[PDB]
From a paper:
RdDM requires two plant-specific RNA polymerases known as RNA polymerase IV (Pol IV) and RNA polymerase V (Pol V), and a number of accessory proteins with different functions. All together, these observations have positioned the DDR complex as a key component that acts downstream of the methylation readers SUVH2/SUVH9 to recruit Pol V to RdDM loci. We report here the structures of the Arabidopsis Pol V recruitment complexes DR (DMS3-RDM1) and DDR′ (DRD1 peptide 7-DMS3-RDM1). The structures of the two complexes are similar at their core—two DMS3 dimers bridged by an RDM1 dimer.
Author numbering:
A (entry chain D): 117 to 139, 149 to 352
B (entry chain A): 39 to 161
C (entry chain G): 45 to 93
D (entry chain B): 39 to 163
E (entry chain F): 43 to 102, 117 to 139, 147 to 352, 357 to 409
F (entry chain E): 46 to 98, 116 to 139, 147 to 405
G (entry chain C): 52 to 99, 117 to 139, 147 to 409
Write the structure that this text describes.
């Protein structure tokens, strides 16, 4: 289950927030590992290895006052118990020993482009690449932002301007990151990429120069599965 | 003198650059972020080197871009990649067919390491 | 001559001399949808968006 | 003294030149013998000015053709005029939308009499 | 909550119908673009017909004409001919080499070139030119020379300047010629306004207006060129002819050499205009010595009729475009009221 | 509705942003007005400083049937001559008389007596036409020619300095007379031809009042007028030096002996056609030199002032759109 | 006509002789430059912990490569591990940047071309990894196998920064523009960008890549790009709207992207960044080595020039020969 994989990271703040959710809380929206649901469990595992466990176990809140409400520093510069999540989680559960990120939706630079018209999941009109002959690259499946299936509450009216969750958060994690089939197909269409690419066989290229190789990573927390 | 040697090198380079043909079918759409990145992806797709003057111009467009608030806006959304691709091929046609050797001689006299803009892509 | 056939196709648009107004129209209806979600939440489950 | 004045005038000029629109359908075919004469004809037909950077770019494209035996042959036949107006409008859209004013003021400090490349055509009305 | 849902339903239905009407107006504008291109082709073909086929543009003995000019070289040549290496080298003077169908266009080209680029004595080789004149040791013209000796022997005097022009040294036109034309003329690119249309008074380039004796259409120069693409391209170098002077000044950025009007208007460079009472030169192009005229005029009538038909079709499509825009505005204000009442 | 209140506060914030932008516009206007007033007090200071401080017309007046003799007889005794700069036999001077007659014979007495206008509206002012096609007697110059009795029945021309295409080549760096750095002809060898003694556009000594800021782009008369009268041509010493240098000639060539070639195929021959008018000889005087330096600085100041006026017109064009957008936004906000 | 063709053939022959003369000139210049580098080689011969922290990590490939460094073509292609290439004069700032970049990008291998990066791994047709890869068998036949993933960066695919370098600064700093608040005044805690503050070794400053770039324009720009170092956390937080993408505080706190804030305790990246050496005369040696690298680069480019002209002279010959035959068949026609 997803929540058991959250509770495996006992030193992380995500299990702390889930334990408070079973029994600060107002500003937060939730963790990224619960918001996104992907049908393709293989592609889910590959994007999970792409993001890294620090970004995907990071909590998202609506405002910046929630960021100032979670952790507060003292006059010396060290983190003590008396901050919000730290005291309210060390009262019952484990402390925060590892780092955790916090992402606030009013400060992100949101997508400002046409959204595919007449669509339910509100996909993004990003430019599909093309080879010199006039055709798409041969193993192109799609941009990785367009795979995540959203809970229909968060599609609109989360931002104070009215933006959704797909065009603020899910753009500013993997912007113009596109999905291929095999790694030789990904190398074959390497000049036509923007920021990175991700192949369904495995193999991760995060920047236009650097690219991972070796084993594929294994992380326990994944995206959830739709029903 | 040194100027005669560098003028001979300029005439060699211009006679090589005149003969490289512009490709026939150029239907393509590459997502890009800067001008130099488009010229690198455009040399990797189409196996031809761009001119010296074209690499200088394609760098100074980005140096002219640096300052303002457009630097955080994606350049893929400002100018269209088919429009930018056609722009760089038209400037490349001008730079292969039109220039002279004395202009190249002066621009290579003004600075050393002029080979940073000349490409090793031979065919 | 290969450049002109593409520059005219980009200068025309999805709708000739109309498409800017249709973009304005889609933004107006988008504002209407945002207001109707702001008034009532559960209507999003009717509109899937 | 003069530096802040040139920076403010460059900001004024770029904020003006961003909003001058490109024409919608251009179907012209201009016989020409140089790049400067081609830009003068494209100013006189389409009543719009060209940016500061395009005028010095066309002066450099006209000056690079000095010294050859192909200097005397006509540029109309080397480069087709539709292909030589398309590049003017694409370079002009690049020069209007993308740059900044710090670059342009740093260019303007290196020369007095920079209004030779700024032109008195006002496209309104 | 039902009024917002009804507003969304009505707004979606009206936006879909309005988008279908946008598809219709796009289709009408595309048909207009196609038909204006076809009209451009027909007007291009009319200008192509008017080069030398039609015997008369719409207007708003040559040996005696040479012999009136008492002092030039061509007068001496014509008076010798109407009475030794110099008679072998000369092809013949530029007034004698050309022929023009209509008097107005020939008179205005003769006023264009000037009365000393009309009396030019042409030569095939530079050895003929250095045989026409001989000099002293100081740099003075000698009276016992090529053209001056037989002039003083026959009586007439070369006292004014005269040109000489080598076919071997003239830079020949090196551009694709017109295929399947027996007169072997030049496909110089025709200017076009920003509408897509040719300039409204435009009648064609003036190097394509001269009719040559077919002995000189090919092989005059040892590299195998004709008189038209060496000599007449270096006298009318993309010179183009308009109908009236207002039509010439109206289409002044599209020129890239001089232009010439059929009323009298002559400009020779870009900034240089010629004003005032029009000068009169005595030498004129001759008139060629009519069933080709009748066939050309029949084809002219056919082209003008088909052009009129294309104008009627573009007018009908423009009317239907206007009706589509009207219904567009009505549907737009309808659903704007439908969204603004909520 | 709290969401409509948040909408109204965003509308008020955008109204405040438009107000800050429009007061920035009028601040920029006031800066430009102060700059123009600095220019104007400098030009009035220069005005009071300046106000403290064989013949060409006898040769022009003999050509009685052209416009040049008409304007000469008028200036020895309207709305036309506010734009007319002057007959081109009076705008330039060369030192040596033989080379004067050579460069005058090159151009011909129809383009040596040519009335250059500053602008095309002056070219429309010089000649006016009926609806039929003849010249009108109530036109510009023909009124003057009939008011005197001067008979302009010979054809003339009109150079329009705004419509001339200028030379794009860089001028000799740090020069007094602003000569043009034209590429000299070179043989198959490295050396120049043996008779080459310079071009002919660089030989006309132009007046210091006209060197800069004549044309609206800031061009002289050598860069426009005396370049478009004769482009790129060479001046050789003798005729044999001219004939031996045919593979390296540019657009034309003349020699001091009296040999002219206009084009790469045409070799003029025969006796020499005379042109009666010619360029004059420049005179040397220091008071007129100081007055002409004052007039050159005056013309450069007037050009800078006119460009500042162009820029204030440009920023007014921006502030009108700022006014219109702010008013439309106020109408939209008060409407809802 | 034959009168065009005779002149055309003789022009082609003169062109061929010109190309042979140009090959002779370029080979003379190449021999001169090679004699110069032989003279510099004999001059250079006449002039004649961090690795422990790499050894703490047994699972990553950088420890394997450190074993092979201390005691085939894989050691020839790879330039060096990221923590071995640069040096920082502060313990604090080095610890903060090594906490920033992560241990995966601090233990990264650095190649010349993509060919070396194909030489590092191997993938069979089933898509599963075997130890028949060169780096994997290199690791298994001497020590332990490699379980943690590693990244290989490529010096030719790295898109370089394109800004004027601070004029004649020896370290080749970047000409980055400083941030400005909307009142026109510099932020108070701003003490520099993190990419200029690394001391980089003088052998690698210039002409590393085939274009002639250093390691600061290619390697250390693309690791962290135009990030701003502030003195304390509050100076970083208060100046949030003026930063570009990236912010670092010496107190503790990194703003990765413009909306991401880092809170909580800090996972100590046990690999640190190195320190510059004390003043020793060996830098003189390193100075000579710097010059040697530039000399080699110019010889490389001279080779490209001769190759360029070789292609052109082939088009001078073949056409000519064909044209020669065409000439005589015209003379065989009439």
């Amino acid at each position: 289950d997803i929540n058991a994989q959250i509770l495996r990271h006992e030193n992380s703040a995500a299990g702390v927030l889930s334990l408070v959710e079973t029994l600060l809380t107002k500003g937060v929206v939730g963790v990224v590992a619960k918001l996104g649901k992907v049908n393709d469990e293989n592609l889910s595992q590959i994007l999970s290895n792409y993001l890294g466990t620090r970004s995907m176990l990071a909590v998202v809140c609506r405002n910046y006052e929630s960021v100032t409400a979670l952790e507060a520093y003292d006059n010396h510069g060290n983190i003590d118990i008396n901050a919000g999540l730290h005291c309210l989680g060390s009262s019952i559960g484990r402390e925060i020993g590892d780092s955790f990120d916090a992402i606030c939706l009013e400060n992100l630079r949101p997508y400002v482009g046409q959204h595919i018209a007449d669509d339910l999941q509100r996909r993004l009109d990003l430019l599909k690449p093309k080879l010199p002959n006039g055709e798409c690259p041969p193993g192109f499946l799609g941009f990785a932002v367009n795979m995540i299936q959203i809970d229909p509450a968060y599609l609109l009216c989360v931002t104070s301007y009215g933006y959704g969750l797909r065009e603020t958060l899910f753009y500013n994690l993997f912007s113009r990151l596109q999905v291929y089939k095999t790694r030789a197909d990904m190398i074959s269409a390497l000049p036509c990429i923007s920021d990175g690419a991700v192949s369904l066989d495995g193999g991760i290229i995060r920047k236009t120069g650097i690219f991972n190789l070796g084993n594929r990573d294994e992380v326990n927390v994944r995206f959830a599965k739709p029903t | 003198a040194d100027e005669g040697s560098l003028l001979r090198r300029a005439e060699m380079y211009q006679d090589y650059m005149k003969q490289v043909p512009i490709p026939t079918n150029r239907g393509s759409l590459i997502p890009f972020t800067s001008w130099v990145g488009l010229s690198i992806s455009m040399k990797q797709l189409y196996g031809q080197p761009l001119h010296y003057l074209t690499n200088v111009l394609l760098q100074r467009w980005d140096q002219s871009r640096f300052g303002t608030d457009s630097e955080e806006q994606r350049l893929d959304s400002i100018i269209h990649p088919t429009k930018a691709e056609a722009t760089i091929w038209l400037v490349e046609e001008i730079h292969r067919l039109t220039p002279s050797h004395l202009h190249m001689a002066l621009l290579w006299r003004s600075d050393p390491m002029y080979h940073s803009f000349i490409d090793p892509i031979f065919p | 001559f290969a450049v002109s056939n593409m520059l005219e196709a980009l200068d025309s648009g999805k709708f000739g001399s109309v498409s800017k107004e249709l973009e304005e129209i889609a933004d107006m209806r988008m504002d209407l949808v945002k207001r109707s979600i702001w008034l009532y939440p559960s209507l999003a489950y009717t509109v899937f968006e």
